[PDB]
Amino acid sequence: MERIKELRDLMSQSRTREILTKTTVDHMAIIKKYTSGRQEKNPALRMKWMMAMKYPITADKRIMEMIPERNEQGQTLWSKTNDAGSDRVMVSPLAVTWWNRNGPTTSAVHYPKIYKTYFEKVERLKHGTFGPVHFRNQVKIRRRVDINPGHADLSAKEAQDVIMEVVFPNEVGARILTSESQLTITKEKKEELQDCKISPLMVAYMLERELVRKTRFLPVAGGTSSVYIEVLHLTQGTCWEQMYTPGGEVRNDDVDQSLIIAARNIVRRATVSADPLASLLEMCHSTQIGGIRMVDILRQNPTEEQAVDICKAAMGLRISSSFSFGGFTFKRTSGSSVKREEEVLTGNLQTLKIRVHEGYEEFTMVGRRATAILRKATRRLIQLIVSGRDEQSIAEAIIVAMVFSQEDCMIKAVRGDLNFVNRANQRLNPMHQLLRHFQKDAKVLFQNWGIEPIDNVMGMIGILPDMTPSTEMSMRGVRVSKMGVDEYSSTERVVVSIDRFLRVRDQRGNVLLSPEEVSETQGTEKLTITYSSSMMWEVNGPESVLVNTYQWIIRNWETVKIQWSQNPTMLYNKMEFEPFQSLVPKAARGQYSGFVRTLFQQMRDVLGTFDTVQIIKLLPFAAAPPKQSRMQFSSLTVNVRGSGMRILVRGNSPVFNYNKATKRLTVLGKDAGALTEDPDEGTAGVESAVLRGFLILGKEDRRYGPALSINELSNLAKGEKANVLIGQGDVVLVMKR
Amino acid sequence: GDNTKWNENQNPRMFLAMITYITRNQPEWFRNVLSIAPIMFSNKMARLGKG
Amino acid sequence: PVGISSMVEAMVSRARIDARIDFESGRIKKEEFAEIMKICSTIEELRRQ
Amino acid sequence: FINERGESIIVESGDPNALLKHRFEIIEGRDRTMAWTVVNSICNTTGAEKPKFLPALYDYKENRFIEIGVTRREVHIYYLEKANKIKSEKTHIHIFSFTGEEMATKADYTLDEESRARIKTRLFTIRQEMASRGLWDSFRQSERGEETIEERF
RNA sequence: AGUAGAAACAAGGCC
RNA sequence: GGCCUGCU
């Protein structure tokens, strides 16, 4: 209502009426930006020179009544002098800090919602886990990536339209949404903003920031997933590198993409390996992705891919079927077949023996960027339909089908040097060699296949040798189509054998996989590939001495757990913890020892407190002769590369982390044994083996005052509860004994 | 390498020739609105300065 | 903002439509509707001068 | 001018009242921005389906739009083009040719026949003036190119 | 004098 | 002396 009253008052005057009437809606932008003050050419100089003056800030007129003229001392906070070309009055930064320390309060509970992207970023960073740092050359290739972690797959204009419809329903204009996905996201947003008190402009800006997708050109090497590119400055260097696992939406898509690329790489490397089976097994057991081990995902996620299936079978777990050909996945759906072990000649007159199959049979081709369905007979193709995306995809599918047909029209087309021996001097599969030869270009296979008539049924399009559709005469048996997906996703995982050279086979005797099918494409992982291999323990690295020590105490846990309780002095003075002690610095051995022994002793004293991780962690430090002391520690240093790696008493670390899900212990990126569940594990929230003379009753409470620190706790006395901030910025309650 | 006196040699009439060759077989209005810029730059007067 | 209608005319049209829709289903009642409509009428009269 | 209930007084001239309650809300001749703003506002408040193209007027008692056109070509072709243009048409369509031929959808002419006669007289007088001038044939043969706009820089 | 370098500052406008 | 400016 007051809008029209203000409009009337404004138009009452002459100049205001003239500007109101003459100017049209289009000129509003020009009138808004109409200003005499030009932009700063050197903002830094002006800012440095302006803060020296009094009143270098401009604030709305409301300051006049919201903030006093002067603070307690008498320093002016605002001046009635007006700005150059506005009603804003001039104030000094004293005004800003006065507002911050005395200004009206408010409930900011909705602030995390409005800026949800930044708080989600902090959430990811807080829950992220680090690993060892590797010094090694980085091939910093430059490519385009996505910088928005949660882009909603919308163009800038489409995103603007969605924002305007969500926040400004009436101003949407002529635009009407079309895609059902847009409508779904619009409804999702509208439901959650049915009542929001913040200004519409802020909501619109937030939706624009968290919907529009952003792309920038960066020198990335490893990653490219929007979550990884966010922290690119922390996991990528000129010579150094680090493994980082963002603590966020471990989306199945990203995990499976990383798994697929890792499978491709491992298979490619195993192909050249002297003993591919053993090397593949050890490397699969000696690598992880995104902080999760390869075996866990492999046994968990079912994902169809030649390399992925190869890894699945290698472990001996349940293995898939539906044989593949030329990188495509074939599923028979009709008929029997028998090989014949026959002999023939080529067009280049080279003689060769092959195995041709019997019977009429239909097949369901599948692939990465194509799809097809085939019907054939003994040595003879019957029909072929294809569903590729691009024209070269259909060409690939067609040449693969022609090779699969084993027709003499293909045999009498082979021309040139096609030697069936590998780099390793291993005779190569004939089929893959033909299929690789016909992938440069299959011109001769096209002019030598044949021609037939067609009924012109369904209005189907004709075939193309070199992009020439022929709607009345065409290749024999071959058809043109474009389906959306193959017949159906197969339903059976089979058993198999493997030769030394990784030639997978089935129960009957047919061939199922081989190192020639591994597509070949060199993709980019989404999650960091923790390809632990050279990354090692030399002949005896910490991954050896240290990592191994923890492994020994894991394996002998059954008698250490009971020797730890009775006669423990004969466990500390043990011949297995001596290589470890050589790494602890000679000055802080006995201090650590007294600390840890007092920990374990008062952990034995009070009942209901037992954590196997603490005992497995702190024993190599109690080996040394005990020197007494009065202080306390948040970590324990061990010298690994003239560098002090700190092992945290309370909680996990990049050097020592026990996963609570898969129960594996992990030292330095190397597995060190599965850890077992003692039934006497006190699940009471109490931790008696973190502080020297103090327990940990639980989480913080605001009654006992602010958070004291580790090095200021001797002030307390008997029975004096208190709060302490320890660990990775975590406050807890403690109690003296 | 590096070109010397780059600005003092790009005659606007060459820009007009390029704009006319780019806009072959285009609506006359578009051709005119594109060609108007070099035509105005060919007759520019450079105001001297503060003095 | 796009459009070629003078600023006063756009403001008055928006006010009239807003009042209309509010009165049709909303808070605005007959008295306020009459007051706002007559204010808009006099604003238009002032414009036309 | 509608009233408390669904009826109108349809005065002749200069008969206002405190209960204005206008029966029609003109949409044509408001500018594209304002026209679309009002269309979206009324569609939101009522919850109807927004017409793809800009209508001419609106019906408040019945809550539907109305499209009105003037044609020099054959009336039936123009009417069917209007009908097929308005997808899933929930809006009444009305056509007024100069010669007097009239049409609509379902023949639901929700208007006083006196208004129809007045508009017919206005169109007939305009036709008389055009014929006296002699531009009527040019208007008849020039409607084809009116919809398209060519830049004339 | 001094800064500074192809032209300037070493205070300027108005009542 | 007073007002006004410290990229106009």
UniProtKB/Swiss-Prot annotation, chain A:
Site (Mammalian adaptation): K627
Keyword list, A-Z: Cap snatching, Eukaryotic host gene expression shutoff by virus, Eukaryotic host transcription shutoff by virus, Host gene expression shutoff by virus, Host mitochondrion, Host nucleus, Host-virus interaction, Inhibition of host innate immune response by virus, Inhibition of host MAVS by virus, Inhibition of host RLR pathway by virus, Inhibition of host RNA polymerase II by virus, mRNA capping, mRNA processing, Viral immunoevasion, Viral transcription, Virion
Matching Pfam families: Flu_PB2_1st (PF20947), Flu_PB2_2nd (PF20948), Flu_PB2_3rd (PF20949), Flu_PB2_4th (PF20950), Flu_PB2_5th (PF00604), Flu_PB2_6th (PF20951), Flu_PB2_7th (PF20952)
Subcellular location: Virion; Host nucleus; Host mitochondrion
One GO MF term: RNA binding
Principal location class: virion
Keyword 4Fe-4S set for record: no
GO cellular component terms given for this protein: host cell mitochondrion; host cell nucleus; virion component
Domain of life: Viruses
A GO biological process held by the record: DNA-templated transcription
Record text on subunit structure and interactions: Influenza RNA polymerase is composed of three subunits: PB1, PB2 and PA. Interacts (via N-terminus) with PB1 (via C-terminus). Interacts with nucleoprotein NP (via N-terminus). Interacts (via N-terminus) with host MAVS (via N-terminus); this interaction inhibits host innate immune response.
Comment field (misc): South Carolina isolate has been sequenced from formalid fixed-lung tissues of a 21-year-old male which died in 1918 at Ft. Jackson, SC. Brevig Mission isolate has been sequenced from lung tissues of an Inuit woman buried in the permafrost in a gravesite near Brevig Mission, Alaska. This sample was recovered by John Hultin, retired pathologist.
Family: Belongs to the influenza viruses PB2 family.
UniProt-recorded name of the protein: Polymerase basic protein 2
Gene: PB2
Curated annotation (Swiss-Prot), chain B:
Processing and modification events after translation: Phosphorylated by host PRKCA.
Compartments it resides in: Host nucleus; Host cytoplasm
Domain of life the protein comes from: Viruses
Cysteines paired by S-S bonds: none
Assembly, per entry: Influenza RNA polymerase is composed of three subunits: PB1, PB2 and PA. Interacts (via N-terminus) with PA (via C-terminus). Interacts (via C-terminus) with PB2 (via N-terminus); this interaction is essential for transcription initiation. Interacts (via C-terminus) with human PKP2 (via N-terminus); the interaction competitively inhibits the interaction between the RNA polymerase subunits PB1 and PB2.
Note: South Carolina isolate has been sequenced from formalid fixed-lung tissues of a 21-year-old male which died in 1918 at Ft. Jackson, SC. Brevig Mission isolate has been sequenced from lung tissues of an Inuit woman buried in the permafrost in a gravesite near Brevig Mission, Alaska. This sample was recovered by John Hultin, retired pathologist.
Function summary: RNA-dependent RNA polymerase which is responsible for replication and transcription of virus RNA segments. The transcription of viral mRNAs occurs by a unique mechanism called cap-snatching. 5' methylated caps of cellular mRNAs are cleaved after 10-13 nucleotides by PA. In turn, these short capped RNAs are used as primers by PB1 for transcription of viral mRNAs. During virus replication, PB1 initiates RNA synthesis and copy vRNA into complementary RNA (cRNA) which in turn serves as a template for the production of more vRNAs.
Family recorded in the similarity comment: Belongs to the influenza viruses polymerase PB1 family.
Name under which the protein is recorded: RNA-directed RNA polymerase catalytic subunit
Species per Swiss-Prot/TrEMBL record: Influenza A virus (strain A/Brevig Mission/1/1918 H1N1) (Influenza A virus (strain A/South Carolina/1/1918 H1N1))
Gene: PB1
UniProtKB/Swiss-Prot annotation, chain D:
UniProt-annotated binding residues for Mn(2+) 2: E28, A56
Signal peptide: none
Superkingdom of origin: Viruses
Post-translational modification: Phosphorylated on serines and threonines by host kinases, including human casein kinase II.
Annotated function: Plays an essential role in viral RNA transcription and replication by forming the heterotrimeric polymerase complex together with PB1 and PB2 subunits. The complex transcribes viral mRNAs by using a unique mechanism called cap-snatching. It consists in the hijacking and cleavage of host capped pre-mRNAs. These short capped RNAs are then used as primers for viral mRNAs. The PB2 subunit is responsible for the binding of the 5' cap of cellular pre-mRNAs which are subsequently cleaved after 10-13 nucleotides by the PA subunit that carries the endonuclease activity.
Subunit structure: Influenza RNA polymerase is composed of three subunits: PB1, PB2 and PA. Interacts (via C-terminus) with PB1 (via N-terminus).
Name of the protein this chain belongs to: Polymerase acidic protein
Segment of the intact protein contained: 53 to 205 of 716
